[PDB]
């Protein structure tokens, strides 16, 4: 069994731009999560060697995870809020799409979800 490269977290050739919306996405919106009860499946890349599961990079195939967000967030890597919100979608998404109703990691990702949503309700207006 084998695990793929994470998602690439540095990248020269990817544009990219600080703004205050990103700056409130990381001190805000992941510092909210990172430190919630139940972000820890979700602080680095799914290891479907070590968890056996197999079919999870046949089914997930735009994997994300705070880790990456994380790290994407402090290398200011994104260029807009957008693309920092759809890692989000992309990782609650993910969890969904593979596991099932009622699962204890899918109600960890909708503890997630909830806050996430309630945070980036306010996110600041482009200054
Ligand atoms: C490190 C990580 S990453 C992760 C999990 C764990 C443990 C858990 C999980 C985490 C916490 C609790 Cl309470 C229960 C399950 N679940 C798997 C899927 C699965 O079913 O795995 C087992 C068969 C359970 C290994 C899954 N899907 N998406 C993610 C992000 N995760
Ligand atoms: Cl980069």
Same mark, same amino acid.
């Given at each position: 069994?084998?695990?793929?490269?994470?998602?690439?977290?540095?990248?020269?050739?990817?544009?990219?731009?600080?703004?205050?919306?990103?700056?409130?996405?990381?001190?805000?919106? &992941?510092?909210?999560?990172?430190?919630?009860?139940?972000?820890?499946?979700?602080?680095?890349?799914?290891?479907?060697?070590?968890?056996?599961?197999?079919?999870?990079?046949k089914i997930?195939?735009?994997?994300?995870?705070?880790?990456?967000?994380?790290?994407?967030?402090?290398?200011?890597?994104?260029?807009?809020?957008?693309?920092?919100?759809?890692?989000?979608?992309?990782?609650?998404?993910?969890?969904?799409?593979?596991?099932?109703?009622?699962?204890?990691?899918? &109600?960890?990702?909708?503890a997630l979800?909830? &806050?996430?949503?309630?945070?980036?309700?306010?996110?600041?207006?482009?200054e």
């Amino acid at each position: 069994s084998m695990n793929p490269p994470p998602p690439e977290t540095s990248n020269p050739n990817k544009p990219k731009r600080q703004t205050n919306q990103l700056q409130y996405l990381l001190r805000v919106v &992941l510092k909210t999560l990172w430190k919630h009860q139940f972000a820890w499946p979700f602080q680095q890349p799914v290891d479907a060697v070590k968890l056996n599961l197999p079919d999870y990079y046949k089914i997930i195939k735009t994997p994300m995870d705070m880790g990456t967000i994380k790290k994407r967030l402090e290398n200011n890597y994104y260029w807009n809020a957008q693309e920092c919100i759809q890692d989000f979608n992309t990782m609650f998404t993910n969890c969904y799409i593979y596991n099932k109703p009622g699962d204890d990691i899918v &109600l960890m990702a909708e503890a997630l979800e909830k &806050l996430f949503l309630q945070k980036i309700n306010e996110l600041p207006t482009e200054e």
